[PDB]
Design a binder for this molecule. Structure first.
Ligand SMILES: Cc1cc2nc3c(=O)[nH]c(=O)nc-3n(C[C@H](O)[C@H](O)[C@H](O)COP(=O)(O)O)c2cc1C
Ligand SMILES: CCOC(=O)/C(=N\O)C(C)=O
Length: 365
C-alpha cells in the first residue's frame, strides 16, 4: 500500500500519507476551542499521522461560520494548547489552518454588524446562501473593499496568528488561500476588480497571497507553513478566466519564496476541481500544478481509498487528505490500512454545535 510508506515533510517524519483535511465543524463555542475539539482530534490522531485543523480565525472579522475557533486571543491559545497536547500524546503532527472568509460572511458574524471585508464590493450572488447561527440561511451582503493599509494589517493578523499557533504548540500552520475566501477573492479575476497594486494583472492578484505566505514564513519558518489553493472550484462565485495560469503563477511565487528563504514550505495543498459543498481537464490541472511546484503536494477533494492509493502510486501527490470520510471514521487511517468498510457520514451534523452527536460518537471498528 503506497499510502503507508513513510514520508518526510520537512522536519516531520510522517508514518503514513493519510491526512486529516481541514474541516469547519462549528463546535468551538463562542470561537473558543472546546474540550469537544480535543476529543475529536485525539480520536483521529495516529502515530506519525498529519492532522490539519478546521479553519481558524485570525481576527474578529475573519469569521463567516458560527462557533469556529480563533487563535488571535490568549484565551484561544491556552485552550488550543490543551488540544495540541492530546494530539501530540498520540504521536501525530498537527497544523492550524488560518482562515479569513472575507466576503463569505454576514452582518451577524461581524463585530458591530459591520460589512465583511474583501478585495471588491461585489457580493456573492443569490445562488449561494450562508448558514446562520440559528440554522436558517441568510443572504451574503455587499463587502467593503479594503485599501492597502488594511491589507497590511490583515497580513499582520496572519503573522500574529502564526506565532500564536506555535505558542499553542502547533507543529505549523496552513494558509487557507482557497475556496473563494479572503485570499481567493484577491487571486481570482472573477472577483478581484481592483485597479490598484493588488488587482488588474495576474502578478497583482498574486501579491496578497505572496505577502501573507512571506510574513508567516518569516514568522515561524518556511518548513512550518503550508499553503492551500483551489485555482478551479465551484464555490462562492470564485472563478478565474484562466485557472491553470493562476495556479501556475501562485506556484512560481511559492517556489521563489522557498529559494529566497533557503527552505522548503511544508507543502502545497490543492483542491481537486470536482469537489463542491471534463475529468481529464481536472486531473490535468492537478498534475500540472504538482509537476511545477518544488516540494510536497497534498491533494484533496473527493478522494477514496482507491483514488488515494493511485494518487501516491502514480506520483500525482505525496500526501492525500480526507474530509468527509474522516468525519464519520475516526480510525480512517486504520480502516484504509486494513481496507475495512467505512462508516457513512451525516451531513446534517457537519455544522451543528453538539459536542458529541455527529462529532465524537462515530464508532471505531
Ligand atoms: C464539513 C466540512 C468542513 C470543511 N471545512 C473546511 C475548512 O475549514 N478549510 C478547508 O480548507 N476545507 C474545508 N472543507 C474541505 C476539506 O478540507 C476537504 O478538502 C474536502 O472535504 C475533501 O473532500 P472529501 O470530503 O471527499 O474527503 C470542509 C469540508 C467539509 C465536509
Ligand atoms: C467546497 C470548498 O469549500 C469548503 O469546503 C469549505 N471551506 O473551505 C466549507 C466550510 O464548506
Amino acid at each position: 500500500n503506497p499510502l503507508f510508506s513513510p514520508y518526510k515533510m520537512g522536519k516531520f517524519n510522517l508514518s503514513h500519507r493519510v491526512v486529516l483535511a481541514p474541516m469547519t465543524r462549528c463546535r468551538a463555542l463562542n470561537n473558543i476551542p472546546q474540550a469537544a475539539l480535543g476529543e475529536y482530534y485525539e480520536q483521529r490522531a495516529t502515530a506519525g499521522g498529519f492532522l490539519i485543523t478546521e479553519g481558524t480565525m485570525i481576527s474578529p472579522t475573519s469569521a463567516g461560520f458560527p462557533h469556529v475557533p480563533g487563535i488571535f486571543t490568549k484565551e484561544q491559545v491556552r485552550e488550543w494548547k490543551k488540544i495540541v497536547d492530546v494530539v501530540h500524546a498520540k504521536g501525530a503532527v498537527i497544523f492550524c489552518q488560518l482562515w479569513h472568509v472575507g466576503r463569505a460572511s454576514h452582518e451577524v458574524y461581524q463585530p458591530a454588524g459591520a460589512a465583511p471585508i474583501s478585495s471588491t464590493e461585489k457580493p456573492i450572488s443569490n445562488r449561494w446562501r450562508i448558514l446562520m447561527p440559528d440554522g436558517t440561511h441568510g443572504i451574503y451582503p455587499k463587502p467593503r473593499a479594503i485599501g492597502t493599509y488594511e491589507i497590511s494589517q490583515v497580513v499582520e493578523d496572519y503573522r500574529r496568528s502564526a506565532l500564536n499557533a506555535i505558542e499553542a504548540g502547533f507543529d505549523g500552520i496552513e494558509i487557507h488561500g482557497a475556496h473563494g475566501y479572503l485570499i481567493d477573492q484577491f487571486l481570482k479575476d472573477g472577483i478581484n476588480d481592483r485597479t490598484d497594486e493588488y488587482g488588474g494583472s495576474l502578478a497583482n492578484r498574486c501579491k496578497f497571497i505572496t505577502q501573507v505566505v512571506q510574513a508567516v514564513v518569516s514568522a515561524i519558518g518556511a518548513d512550518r507553513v503550508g499553503v492551500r489553493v483551489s485555482p478551479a472550484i465551484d464555490h462562492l462565485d470564485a472563478m478565474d478566466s484562466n485557472p491553470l495560469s493562476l495556479g501556475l503563477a501562485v506556484v512560481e511565487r511559492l517556489n521563489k519564496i522557498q529559494l529566497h528563504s533557503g527552505s522548503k514550505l511544508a507543502y502545497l495543498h490543492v483542491t481537486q476541481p470536482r469537489y463542491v459543498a471534463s475529468e481529464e481537464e481536472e486531473a490535468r490541472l492537478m498534475r500540472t500544478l504538482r509537476n511545477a511546484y518544488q516540494g510536497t503536494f497534498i491533494c484533496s477533494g473527493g478522494y477514496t481509498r482507491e483514488l488515494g492509493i493511485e494518487a501516491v502510486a502514480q506520483g500525482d501527490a505525496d500526501l492525500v487528505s480526507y474530509g468527509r470520510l474522516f468525519i464519520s471514521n475516526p480510525d480512517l487511517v486504520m480502516r484504509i490500512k486494513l481496507n475495512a468498510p467505512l462508516n457513512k457520514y451525516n451531513r446534517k451534523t457537519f455544522y451543528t454545535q453538539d459536542p458529541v452527536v455527529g462529532y465524537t460518537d462515530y464508532p471505531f471498528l
